[PDB]
Amino acid sequence: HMEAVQNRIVEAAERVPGVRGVIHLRARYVGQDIWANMIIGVDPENTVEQAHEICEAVQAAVCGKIRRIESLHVSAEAR
Amino acid sequence: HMEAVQNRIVEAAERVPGVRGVIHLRARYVGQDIWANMIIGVDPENTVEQAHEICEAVQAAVCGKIRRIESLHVSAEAR
Numbered sequence: 001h002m003e004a005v006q007n008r009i010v011e012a013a014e015r016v017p018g019v020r021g022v023i024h025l026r027a028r029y030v031g032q033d034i035w036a037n038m039i040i041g042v043d044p045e046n047t048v049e050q051a052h053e054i055c056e057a058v059q060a061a062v063c064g065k066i067r068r069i070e071s072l073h074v075s076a077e078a079r
Numbered sequence: 080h081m082e083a084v085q086n087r088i089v090e091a092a093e094r095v096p097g098v099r100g101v102i103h104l105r106a107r108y109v110g111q112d113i114w115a116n117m118i119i120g121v122d123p124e125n126t127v128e129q130a131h132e133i134c135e136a137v138q139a140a141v142c143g144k145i146r147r148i149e150s151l152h153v154s155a156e157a158r
């Protein structure tokens with residue numbers, strides 16, 4: 001059941017402005033819920049504040065599209 | 080498991096240009112696959128050809144977003 005959800009997560013994150021790919025995604029089931037941790041690429045010339053905004057937008061987009069996700073941490077790396 | 084998928088189907092169809100709501104949706108599991116039949120509302124002043132285009136765009140959008148769907152029939156009604 002996980003591969004389909006992971007695809008949806010990647011797809012949803014990569015649609016958000018400022019995301020330069022999903023570098024890392026670890027998702028696991030906690031019962032019927034998904035808990036996930038993600039790293040996104042961002043432009044090295046974005047400010048840290050902008051990167052933080054992009055992370056927050058990813059969290060909103062992904063959580064909004066995939067209802068079973070109950071925890072999602074997003075961080076950023078220069079790419 | 081079905082309610083989540085039906086939500087995704089409605090949501091995906093209602094995002095397509097020219098769709099004036101999902102009037103009817105019957106979805107059923109055939110094993111792990113979904114087979115569905117849908118009626119969408121359309122502007123009574125669209126041509127039949129335009130309605131046919133909108134139906135085809137709905138089928139593409141829904142099938143593209145929901146991988147488990149293996150059959151989807153879409154028709155249109157004036158609304």
Ligand SMILES: [Cu+2]
Pocket residue numbers: 052
């Ligand atoms: Cu903030």
Ligand SMILES: [Cu+2]
Pocket residue numbers: 131
């Ligand atoms: Cu045609």
